[PDB]
């Protein structure tokens, strides 16, 4: 019964896995763009 | 000096833009163009222009000798 309840909870959590992964990818892309811009600015400043 | 101040202002503006809109990926490419400006920067602010004025100072060098000649004039007064 505990195993079946855990499987049901995992299924209920994965029911929104598509939206979860989409939002995570959007956040990761935004953070990567921000980090890339900051790194480019810092590299240009250090070079100059 | 005005161009350096403008470059600093533009760098501050680009930093503010990257903090406000970080989707720019070509900004670093402009740094490559700075290399061209770096060529001009090869004679920017430190230790190359005064030498040219030293050319005129070359004449003044002989004037310094004339100053010594001024002291030599005292020998004539002797």
Swiss-Prot record, chain A:
Subcellular location(s) of the protein: Nucleus
Tree of life domain: Eukaryota
Oligomer and partners: Component of the Mediator complex, which is composed of MED1, MED4, MED6, MED7, MED8, MED9, MED10, MED11, MED12, MED13, MED13L, MED14, MED15, MED16, MED17, MED18, MED19, MED20, MED21, MED22, MED23, MED24, MED25, MED26, MED27, MED29, MED30, MED31, CCNC, CDK8 and CDC2L6/CDK11. The MED12, MED13, CCNC and CDK8 subunits form a distinct module termed the CDK8 module. Mediator containing the CDK8 module is less active than Mediator lacking this module in supporting transcriptional activation.
Function summary: Component of the Mediator complex, a coactivator involved in the regulated transcription of nearly all RNA polymerase II-dependent genes. Mediator functions as a bridge to convey information from gene-specific regulatory proteins to the basal RNA polymerase II transcription machinery. Mediator is recruited to promoters by direct interactions with regulatory proteins and serves as a scaffold for the assembly of a functional preinitiation complex with RNA polymerase II and the general transcription factors.
Homology family: Belongs to the Mediator complex subunit 14 family.
Official protein name in the record: Mediator of RNA polymerase II transcription subunit 14
Provenance organism: Mus musculus (Mouse)
Gene that encodes the chain: Med14
Curated annotation (Swiss-Prot), chain B:
Shown residues in whole-protein numbering: 79 to 156 of 233
Protein's job: Component of the Mediator complex, a coactivator involved in the regulated transcription of nearly all RNA polymerase II-dependent genes. Mediator functions as a bridge to convey information from gene-specific regulatory proteins to the basal RNA polymerase II transcription machinery. Mediator is recruited to promoters by direct interactions with regulatory proteins and serves as a scaffold for the assembly of a functional preinitiation complex with RNA polymerase II and the general transcription factors.
Highest taxon listed in the record's lineage: Eukaryota
Sequence similarity: Belongs to the Mediator complex subunit 7 family.
Lineage: Eukaryota, Metazoa, Chordata, Craniata, Vertebrata
Subcellular location: Nucleus
Subunit structure as annotated in this protein's UniProt entry: Component of the Mediator complex, which is composed of MED1, MED4, MED6, MED7, MED8, MED9, MED10, MED11, MED12, MED13, MED13L, MED14, MED15, MED16, MED17, MED18, MED19, MED20, MED21, MED22, MED23, MED24, MED25, MED26, MED27, MED29, MED30, MED31, CCNC, CDK8 and CDC2L6/CDK11. The MED12, MED13, CCNC and CDK8 subunits form a distinct module termed the CDK8 module. Mediator containing the CDK8 module is less active than Mediator lacking this module in supporting transcriptional activation.
The name this protein goes by in its record: Mediator of RNA polymerase II transcription subunit 7
Natural source organism: Mus musculus
């Amino acid at each position: 019964r505990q195993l079946f309840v855990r499987l049901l909870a995992l299924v209920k959590w994965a029911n929104d896995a598509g939206k979860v992964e989409k939002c995570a990818m959007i956040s990761s892309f935004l953070d990567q763009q921000a980090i890339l811009f900051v790194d480019t600015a810092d590299r240009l400043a250090s070079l100059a | 000096r005005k161009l350096n101040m403008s470059i600093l202002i533009n760098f501050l503006d680009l930093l503010d833009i990257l903090i406000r809109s970080p989707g720019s990926i070509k900004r670093e490419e402009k740094l490559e163009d700075l290399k061209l400006l770096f060529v001009h920067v090869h004679h920017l602010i430190n230790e190359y222009r005064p030498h040219q004025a030293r050319e005129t100072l070359r004449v003044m060098m002989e004037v310094q000798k004339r100053q010594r000649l001024e002291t030599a004039e005292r020998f004539q007064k002797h």
